[PDB]
Amino acid sequence: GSRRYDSRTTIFSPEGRLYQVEYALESISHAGTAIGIMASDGIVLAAERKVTSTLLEQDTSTEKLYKLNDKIAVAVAGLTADAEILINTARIHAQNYLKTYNEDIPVEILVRRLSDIKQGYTQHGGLRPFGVSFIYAGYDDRYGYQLYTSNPSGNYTGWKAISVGANTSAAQTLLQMDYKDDMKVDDAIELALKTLSKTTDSSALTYDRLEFATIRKGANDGEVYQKIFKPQEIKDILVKTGIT
Amino acid sequence: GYDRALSIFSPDGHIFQVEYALEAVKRGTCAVGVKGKNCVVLGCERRSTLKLQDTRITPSKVSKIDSHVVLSFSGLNADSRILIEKARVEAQSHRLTLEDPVTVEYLTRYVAGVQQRYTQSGGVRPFGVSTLIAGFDPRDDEPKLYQTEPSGIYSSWSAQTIGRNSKTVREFLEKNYDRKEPPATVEECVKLTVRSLLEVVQTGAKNIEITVVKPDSDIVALSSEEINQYVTQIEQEKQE
Amino acid sequence: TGYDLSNSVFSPDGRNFQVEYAVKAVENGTTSIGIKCNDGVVFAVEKLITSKLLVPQKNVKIQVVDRHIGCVYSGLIPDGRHLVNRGREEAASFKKLYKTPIPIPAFADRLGQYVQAHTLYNSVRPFGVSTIFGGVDKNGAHLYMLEPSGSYWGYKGAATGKGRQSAKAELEKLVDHHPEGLSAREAVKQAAKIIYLAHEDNKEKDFELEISWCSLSETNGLHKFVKGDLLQEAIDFAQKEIN
Amino acid sequence: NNYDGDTVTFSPTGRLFQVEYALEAIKQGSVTVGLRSNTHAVLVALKRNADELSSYQKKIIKCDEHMGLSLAGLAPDARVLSNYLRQQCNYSSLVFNRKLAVERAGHLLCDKAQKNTQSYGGRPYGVGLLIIGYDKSGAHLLEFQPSGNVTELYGTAIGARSQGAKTYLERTLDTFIKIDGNPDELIKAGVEAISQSLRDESLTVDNLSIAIVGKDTPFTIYDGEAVAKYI
Amino acid sequence: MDIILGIRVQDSVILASSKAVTRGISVLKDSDDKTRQLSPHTLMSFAGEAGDTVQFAEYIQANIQLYSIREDYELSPQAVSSFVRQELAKSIRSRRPYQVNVLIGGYDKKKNKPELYQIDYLGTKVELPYGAHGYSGFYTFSLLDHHYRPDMTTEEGLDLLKLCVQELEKRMPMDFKGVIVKIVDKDGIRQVDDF
Amino acid sequence: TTTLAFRFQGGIIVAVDSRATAGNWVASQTVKKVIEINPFLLGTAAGGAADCQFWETWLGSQCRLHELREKERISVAAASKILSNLVYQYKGAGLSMGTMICGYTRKEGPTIYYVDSDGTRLKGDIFCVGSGQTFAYGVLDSNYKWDLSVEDALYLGKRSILAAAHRDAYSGGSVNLYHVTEDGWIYHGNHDVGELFWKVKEEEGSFNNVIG
Amino acid sequence: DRGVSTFSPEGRLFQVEYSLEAIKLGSTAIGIATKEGVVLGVEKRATSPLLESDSIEKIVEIDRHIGCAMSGLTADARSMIEHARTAAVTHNLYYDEDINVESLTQSVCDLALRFGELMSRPFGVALLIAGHDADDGYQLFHAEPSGTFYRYNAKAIGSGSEGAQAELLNEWHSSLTLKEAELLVLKILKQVMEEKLDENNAQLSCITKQDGFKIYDNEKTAELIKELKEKEAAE
Amino acid sequence: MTDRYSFSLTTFSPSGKLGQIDYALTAVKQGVTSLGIKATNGVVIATEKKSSSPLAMSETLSKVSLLTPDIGAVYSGMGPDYRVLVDKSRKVAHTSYKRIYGEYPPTKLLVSEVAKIMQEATQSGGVRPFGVSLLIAGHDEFNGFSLYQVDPSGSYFPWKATAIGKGSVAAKTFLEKRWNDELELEDAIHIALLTLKESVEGEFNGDTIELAIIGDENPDLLGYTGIPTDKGPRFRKLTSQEINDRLEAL
Numbered sequence A: 001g002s003r004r005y006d007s008r009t010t011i012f013s014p015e016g017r018l019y020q021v022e023y024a025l026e027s028i029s030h031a032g033t034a035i036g037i038m039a040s041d042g043i044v045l046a047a048e049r050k051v052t053s054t055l056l057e058q059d060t061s062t063e064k065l066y067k068l069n070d071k072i073a074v075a076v077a078g079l080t081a082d083a084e085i086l087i088n089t090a091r092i093h094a095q096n097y098l099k100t101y102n103e104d105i106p107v108e109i110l111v112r113r114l115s116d117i118k119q120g121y122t123q124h125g126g127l128r129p130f131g132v133s134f135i136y137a138g139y140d141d142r143y144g145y146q147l148y149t150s151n152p153s154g155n156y157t158g159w160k161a162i163s164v165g166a167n168t169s170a171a172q173t174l175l176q177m178d179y180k181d182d183m184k185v186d187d188a189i190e191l192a193l194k195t196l197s198k199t200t201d202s203s204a205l206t207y208d209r210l211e212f213a214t215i216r217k218g219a220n221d222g223e224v225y226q227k228i229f230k231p232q233e234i235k236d237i238l239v240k241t242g243i244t
Numbered sequence B: 001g002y003d004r005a006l007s008i009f010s011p012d013g014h015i016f017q018v019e020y021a022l023e024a025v026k027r028g029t030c031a032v033g034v035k036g037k038n039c040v041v042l043g044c045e046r047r048s049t050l051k052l053q054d055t056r057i058t059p060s061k062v063s064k065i066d067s068h069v070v071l072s073f074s075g076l077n078a079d080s081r082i083l084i085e086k087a088r089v090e091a092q093s094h095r096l097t098l099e100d101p102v103t104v105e106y107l108t109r110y111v112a113g114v115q116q117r118y119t120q121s122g123g124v125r126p127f128g129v130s131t132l133i134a135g136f137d138p139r140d141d142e143p144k145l146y147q148t149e150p151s152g153i154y155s156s157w158s159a160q161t162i163g164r165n166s167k168t169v170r171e172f173l174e175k176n177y178d179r180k181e182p183p184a185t186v187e188e189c190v191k192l193t194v195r196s197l198l199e200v201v202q203t204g205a206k207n208i209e210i211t212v213v214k215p216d217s218d219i220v221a222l223s224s225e226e227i228n229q230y231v232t233q234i235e236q237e238k239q240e
Numbered sequence C: 001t002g003y004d005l006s007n008s009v010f011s012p013d014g015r016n017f018q019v020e021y022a023v024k025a026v027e028n029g030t031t032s033i034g035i036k037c038n039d040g041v042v043f044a045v046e047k048l049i050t051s052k053l054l055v056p057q058k059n060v061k062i063q064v065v066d067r068h069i070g071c072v073y074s075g076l077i078p079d080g081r082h083l084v085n086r087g088r089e090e091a092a093s094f095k096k097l098y099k100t101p102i103p104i105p106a107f108a109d110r111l112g113q114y115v116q117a118h119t120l121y122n123s124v125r126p127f128g129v130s131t132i133f134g135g136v137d138k139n140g141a142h143l144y145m146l147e148p149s150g151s152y153w154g155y156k157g158a159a160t161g162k163g164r165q166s167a168k169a170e171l172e173k174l175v176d177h178h179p180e181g182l183s184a185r186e187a188v189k190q191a192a193k194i195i196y197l198a199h200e201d202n203k204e205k206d207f208e209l210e211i212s213w214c215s216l217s218e219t220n221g222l223h224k225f226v227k228g229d230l231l232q233e234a235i236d237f238a239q240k241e242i243n
Numbered sequence D: 001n002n003y004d005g006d007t008v009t010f011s012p013t014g015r016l017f018q019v020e021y022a023l024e025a026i027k028q029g030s031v032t033v034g035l036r037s038n039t040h041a042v043l044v045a046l047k048r049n050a051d052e053l054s055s056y057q058k059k060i061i062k063c064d065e066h067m068g069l070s071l072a073g074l075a076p077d078a079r080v081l082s083n084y085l086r087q088q089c090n091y092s093s094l095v096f097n098r099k100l101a102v103e104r105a106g107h108l109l110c111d112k113a114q115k116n117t118q119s120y121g122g123r124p125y126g127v128g129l130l131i132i133g134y135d136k137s138g139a140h141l142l143e144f145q146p147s148g149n150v151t152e153l154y155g156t157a158i159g160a161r162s163q164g165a166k167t168y169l170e171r172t173l174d175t176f177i178k179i180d181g182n183p184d185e186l187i188k189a190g191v192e193a194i195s196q197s198l199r200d201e202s203l204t205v206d207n208l209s210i211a212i213v214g215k216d217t218p219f220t221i222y223d224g225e226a227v228a229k230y231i
Numbered sequence E: 001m002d003i004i005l006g007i008r009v010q011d012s013v014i015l016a017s018s019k020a021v022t023r024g025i026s027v028l029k030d031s032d033d034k035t036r037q038l039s040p041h042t043l044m045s046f047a048g049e050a051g052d053t054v055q056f057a058e059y060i061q062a063n064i065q066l067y068s069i070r071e072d073y074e075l076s077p078q079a080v081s082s083f084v085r086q087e088l089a090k091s092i093r094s095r096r097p098y099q100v101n102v103l104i105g106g107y108d109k110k111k112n113k114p115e116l117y118q119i120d121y122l123g124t125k126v127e128l129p130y131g132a133h134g135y136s137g138f139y140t141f142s143l144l145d146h147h148y149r150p151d152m153t154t155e156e157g158l159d160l161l162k163l164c165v166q167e168l169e170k171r172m173p174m175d176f177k178g179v180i181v182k183i184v185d186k187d188g189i190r191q192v193d194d195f
Numbered sequence F: 001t002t003t004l005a006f007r008f009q010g011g012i013i014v015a016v017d018s019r020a021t022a023g024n025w026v027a028s029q030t031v032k033k034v035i036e037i038n039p040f041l042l043g044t045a046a047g048g049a050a051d052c053q054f055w056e057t058w059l060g061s062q063c064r065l066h067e068l069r070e071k072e073r074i075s076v077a078a079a080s081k082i083l084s085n086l087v088y089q090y091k092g093a094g095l096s097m098g099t100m101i102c103g104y105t106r107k108e109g110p111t112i113y114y115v116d117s118d119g120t121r122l123k124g125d126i127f128c129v130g131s132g133q134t135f136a137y138g139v140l141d142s143n144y145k146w147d148l149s150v151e152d153a154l155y156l157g158k159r160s161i162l163a164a165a166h167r168d169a170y171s172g173g174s175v176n177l178y179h180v181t182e183d184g185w186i187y188h189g190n191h192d193v194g195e196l197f198w199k200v201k202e203e204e205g206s207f208n209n210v211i212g
Numbered sequence G: 001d002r003g004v005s006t007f008s009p010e011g012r013l014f015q016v017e018y019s020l021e022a023i024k025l026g027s028t029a030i031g032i033a034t035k036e037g038v039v040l041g042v043e044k045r046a047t048s049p050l051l052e053s054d055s056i057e058k059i060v061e062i063d064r065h066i067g068c069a070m071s072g073l074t075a076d077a078r079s080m081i082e083h084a085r086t087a088a089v090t091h092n093l094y095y096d097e098d099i100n101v102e103s104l105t106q107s108v109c110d111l112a113l114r115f116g117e118l119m120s121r122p123f124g125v126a127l128l129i130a131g132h133d134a135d136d137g138y139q140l141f142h143a144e145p146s147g148t149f150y151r152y153n154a155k156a157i158g159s160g161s162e163g164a165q166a167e168l169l170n171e172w173h174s175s176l177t178l179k180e181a182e183l184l185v186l187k188i189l190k191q192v193m194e195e196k197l198d199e200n201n202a203q204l205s206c207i208t209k210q211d212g213f214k215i216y217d218n219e220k221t222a223e224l225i226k227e228l229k230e231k232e233a234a235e
Numbered sequence H: 001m002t003d004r005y006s007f008s009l010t011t012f013s014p015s016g017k018l019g020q021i022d023y024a025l026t027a028v029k030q031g032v033t034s035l036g037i038k039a040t041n042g043v044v045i046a047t048e049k050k051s052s053s054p055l056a057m058s059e060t061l062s063k064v065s066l067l068t069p070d071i072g073a074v075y076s077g078m079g080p081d082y083r084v085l086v087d088k089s090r091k092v093a094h095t096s097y098k099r100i101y102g103e104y105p106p107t108k109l110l111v112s113e114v115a116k117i118m119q120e121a122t123q124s125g126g127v128r129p130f131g132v133s134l135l136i137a138g139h140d141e142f143n144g145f146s147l148y149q150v151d152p153s154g155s156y157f158p159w160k161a162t163a164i165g166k167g168s169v170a171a172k173t174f175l176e177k178r179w180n181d182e183l184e185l186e187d188a189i190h191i192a193l194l195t196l197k198e199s200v201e202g203e204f205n206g207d208t209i210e211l212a213i214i215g216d217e218n219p220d221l222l223g224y225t226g227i228p229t230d231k232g233p234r235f236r237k238l239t240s241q242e243i244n245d246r247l248e249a250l
């Protein structure tokens, strides 16, 4: 019958590894680098677009950074199509929690549920896992500003500063060097860009090959604002830090 | 529905998928359980290749199943969440029907049953997780420590360890733990647990987690400085 | 290659090797025939007497569908029974909805589609039988032969099994020598002869003859078995021709 | 070789190897004999044990007051098929107030075994059965094979070394068929028949298993000291 | 079941609930506690159809306790009340709805404010300074309209509650065998044993 | 029916009548309304007869499975809650059951639980259940003290059923007495009202409404 | 790969035969049947000295009149025991009587072949089911994952099974007392066990008509071990 | 019987590649060239009508399809896969949007729904990916004119101008030289015809070229009058005659 053609996506190797999860991570390591940095007064999300063409419409484009709700955003690394499936699920889950409890969803709860969905694809169903790694950047009134990451295994962890996608090894060493705990947002903005600028496979880092976002309490009194940077705003912030 | 029999026998009488799930446990960070005269202590390793972590929000290694029972593990982290969740749901369901919290033996038996079901169900792989379940039965002061594994077998232990380099720390516990006289106090039990982890860990900084469970839902996690004091004390006595 | 390991897989030729392999099981089976006549059809089959311990006349192979259709097959006997069980269900639902008994061409397609369906998926095996069947309806007499692929045509005479070529040659002579037509009682006698002649290709074990027929005049359009005096008369006619 | 992975696959010569391997499980099974006259039908079965400390595996199963079988091969598969027969015999009684014909009993078993040989996932039955019974057309004996093929006979035998008993019955055909109105003599003929399949071992009191059905005799099984008469 | 009251004061929420369980012409029990602790700083009283009441209360209790263990965190009274409402809002369009009315008294530790929610079996939620279910409200609401002040102490609240129980004991047709009173504040939940 | 069970100094008394009715037709006078679940658990039956008989014997099977699985005798609370959760699933379907789960365990001590077919489940010291519950309450309440002796408590239970058996048209036959201690339940005999009434009347001097 | 319910050329089910190999790796379990009762004994086999041996539950009660000992992948036995207990109690509910030991065994063995592509594989555990009923008296059954069961006067399963079975062949007679049978299980267990036999690494049990199924204490078994050693030295 | 293929036929290889998606892209490469150019006041999409036989009527085979009155689509790769996608895309625009909001979906969201369908064929049981790349041009009130590309993986990108299929590499280079942000619609049509002539080999006329625009509203193509807010479809397929007129002043 059909047994002949089954890849058996949810099995263990003799060494006790999940073949498909390992290979999904190998796929993600070729995707454009995404960095998350958490400061005391906000969070930075920076991501490098995958080899851009000059005729690509830059201003009306979304590849790396996605909004989950007013308080939570994610940076993507891997298959965009796969990520969008998961993002819409996450967006719905957030609205269910709000509808149930009349309170915005705590960041960890949202992250856990999304990570639990990925886990299921590695244990049952005989389907391939999602070839996606997320950086979650969000705020709630329990833990404040939080950074998380999840990967195809469905395992998630919390971070002060983290990178996913390509050149994470080099990127994580640079972040580990210059990061400190009393850091501000504007300093974290500078760190994020400097790190990408050194780890990039491109010749020079330009405005048209970047997506940028901040989550500050920089609104008026005790409330959080999400800023998805416009092309011209990235151009200005790139000049202001002296990269171009 | 995906039906494939993934866990099956081999000519020599082995179920390789279950045995390979044990290899995943062997890869996982070390976890140790030691029970004293009036307490149980769960110690856990945390690998130090991860700096720039946020320890406030990062999932803790020891999980409360109920107010009186805890569960630590070694193996795949994502898999462990599924077992912990099921266990937590069963704990509340038991309180609802029996009007009494679960015994540690019962909770262990349930988790072990779930693990076993995944070894002879179609379309699923076994859990790549072994657990240490510890606590005190309702209105009882006798300490309980149990172990489970992917196959589904479970058993009670005076002291036990699982995960990477567990055979080294088990060797330590086998000669250092006296059945006739277990650790009489909390301090003695925690020290023996930290000592056993120091055979394997590396540095006693932010690499060791300790959770102490006492009778009548008295569970607390030790901070860095509190654990560091045991590390400092043990090393000074060692130089002799 | 490996194109022959799974059913419903096309080879580079455009062939389904699994169906062709089922045909080999049919060729291995005992001989069975069908003869179309003036106002009906006649079916006959070879039953190999494996042992003295077989009860004579009590291992019946020819099967009736509804009250007006007869079915006989060569190859895997159980597969043939499964097909007739379906045929009986198909005929029953037709009569349930449309009142009239199922016409033979209509019935032929019902089996044809069902057998063809078992060449569409790898989760099922093709049928290991060629089925000769037919009867009498409002438009007269019809004889059909259905194959593992689902292929069927109408026939003047039909034959399948180990002695099919011998039987086909003998059938072709009847078609040539009787252009105006063959009578029902004649066809029964000829059927006996052709089974006896076709037995030369399976002559280690001696055999038992079994005949059935549908005829507008002789059986009133219903399927009946040939027994007793009419059967012995047909056996004697066949015995006289081989010598 | 490459065409024996499952039952849904034909070989290049048109063989079903999984069905043939199931047939092989019957040849490994212990011998059992079936025979009949015009008044009675008899099953004789050589039971097998694991060792001297173990019991002797029961071979004969009752299906109705007028019908039952003996088995050779996988015993659990015989239990499944005998249970199906029990239901079908029972359905015929409750709905139609009619004792199920032994011939229909065979047809039903054939069709049940067949479905398992044409579908992916399933497997053929790994057992052969000898069904005896007395119905409205007198005594009957059937031979079931898990290929689906069912055969009505005067006498037969299946299992290991069954060829010895089958030859004897082929010689004795004219004698035992006319043992009418005499149960003990028909059993004696069956006990003598199964004896032709014995090697090194002989028929003992807890080794032999006999069953009989007939005109004024319900399907009853004899074991233990009740078969000491026939040794 | 029958009488359940609630009063929110400056620093606490006080719930009063009748002790009688009647069935036919017999008072089967006179010491019944018509409440369940959902979390350390959240208490739910209930009244309605026999069986449904306890079955619903314990079901909610199990769910909130499950959440507490999972997140190692106590849900706010507002969050618990919204969860309860939604369960009742589902219930009302079920094959057999829960016929249970509830009062949810809680202390929000983040806001340092007491909160009282009144939810009926339809899933109709309202935050109130004082609340009641059943026929009780026809006496207590007008009484509290007069005597209630927002800045009252817990002791003043208990005297205000005594005034309600006295009025109900005077004018209600049925003997409800007194009430069990419980106080919800910053220090959790405690029972007044002598009322 | 009339069934009662009360808690006191010396354990639990349980007393039931033995009449079955089909309208005004007296169906039986010799029915067993107490089911012995195990040496430490009793169950009383009031309401629909098949409903009680079927589900209380079923309850016993669930209690047996508990002690097989858990290697420990089931608690009175857990036993009662199995039955209450069961009938709650059938709520509205028309089950008619008024039950009392009485027994002793180490952790609980002597315990009585009232469970009925609307899903009401109540712990308590005294309960009377059935058509004649009010008649039993009248005698039991007016004579009850915690400090009753085993001898006096047994009699009060017996006398309370007799009182209801007399007045309630749908109660009677005979009295079945039980006593539950730390060591388990003890059966204290079947007492026919035919003889018991006159024996009580003469010795006690009560029942002066009746023609002596 | 290949189908789960596939036959070998010799006419055996691959998966069933492979599960039998798993059972040979398991710890030893022995059962002996007498007219005074049936005795069940097992090797506990703790993997480490820190493991509390009393938590090793390889002898199990099904009903008051039926007991059970296991060997192999013991985790697989949980659902088999659960089914057996339910079958026994359910039959008591439907028929107001104790269920026959043979009927119970048959019910358990019906689960065995309910696997394929139902559960994904056969059970990797063998069971010794011992009990008593009014009809056929004291009985001992060996239930395999093949779906087959044999009644035995005495039977050993596990790693030391073939050596222990040959010993039981010589020692068993129809007039054995219960005390004689108890010692005989201890004797044969001590012979096939790796580590030295004592009350902590071996467990005894029995089923009698009068007292039903009882697992022996470590204190009671210890005295039977001491009584056994003295009797062997006495000649 | 029954679909026993409940498992993924597209899986990760050791190198991290998803084979079936890569192979689907290879099929798109073999396909005939199609392109899209965005202007200030409109969008143009175009492709060659590769005729299977001269006896075949190429008018009956439509490579450029209307999805909504303001959205059109064109492809490169396997035609049958495209045909069913257009059916599904038309339906999803109604079921998941118009039947809810009473208006047609904006270009980006319809594209998003089509991408979802193509992604599921990459992960679901017993199915291969779609062997096509789509170019979807459209207009909506709040986003204006837009042009999107959708690949077999389910990924989609917005473009100022692009080309896919056979000679896409050369065609994209040609468009980079000619494209500016001040292009009027007529200028974009002119450039589209120039770009397409490079990839086409045989005949180059209105009968071998298929071209449609997303431009001004067309009241004459609405089919009715009387509702001022309904002003007609912005999608218009250029006729064979209309193409030839622009080929003279080429």
Ligand SMILES: *[C@@](C)(CO)[C@](*)(O)[C@H](Cc1ccccc1)NC(=O)[C@H](Cc1ccc(OC)cc1)NC(=O)[C@H](C)NC(=O)CN1CCOCC1
Binding pocket: F001, F002, F019, F020, F021, F022, F027, F031, F032, F033, F045, F046, F047, F048, F049, F050, F052, F053, F095, F096, F130, F131, F170, F171
């Ligand atoms: C006293 C006598 C008042 O009825 C008790 O409640 C008694 C309790 C009892 C317990 C165990 C065994 C016997 C008796 N109950 C009855 O005797 C009971 C009264 C009753 C009848 C119908 C009811 O509706 C559900 C409720 C209570 N009598 C019966 O159950 C009689 C013997 N059987 C029937 O009426 C048969 N009915 C039952 C309902 O369904 C239709 C058939």
Ligand SMILES: [Mg+2]
Binding pocket: F164, F165, F166, F167, F168, F169, F170, F171, F172
């Ligand atoms: Mg009366």
